[PDB]
Design a binder for this molecule. Sequence first.
Ligand SMILES: O=P(O)(O)Oc1ccccc1
Length: 155
Amino acid sequence: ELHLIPPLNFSMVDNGIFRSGFPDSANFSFLQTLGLRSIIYLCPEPYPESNLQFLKSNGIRLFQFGIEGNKEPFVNIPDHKIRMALKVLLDEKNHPVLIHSKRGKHRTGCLVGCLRKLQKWCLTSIFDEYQRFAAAKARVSDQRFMEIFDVSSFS
Ligand SMILES: O=P(O)(O)Oc1ccccc1
């Protein structure tokens, strides 16, 4: 009975932290197995009724930090929104937490890369993980955002 379907680009980031693209009803039975307390949602669009009923049924808190989905070379990742998401991500009371965007590549990739910088990973190691998810859609601007991200306020 091969029946569980993780959401698009699903991965475990760390103890209590997951990343993916946008979950749909086919992914709900899999997400139930994780015992989520929180979702960090990085798109501005309203959450669909299907997903809201999943959250309500499972007692999952929704944190929305809407980042516009821009394309290179006109990408302007908002530092403030990433930092608000990081503040929630670093509070273990919110774990287990799923970070998701639409595809789990750009917005999700930036938030995870900034977590890795706080975890003292080498930039080349952060970029390698970012590229594994983003694949042919890897953006230099996402990696430059991580390069210049000042960790001072979170250490
Ligand atoms: O910002 P996201 O993680 O949703 O990732 C993408 C990547 C390519 C196109 C749209 C979205």
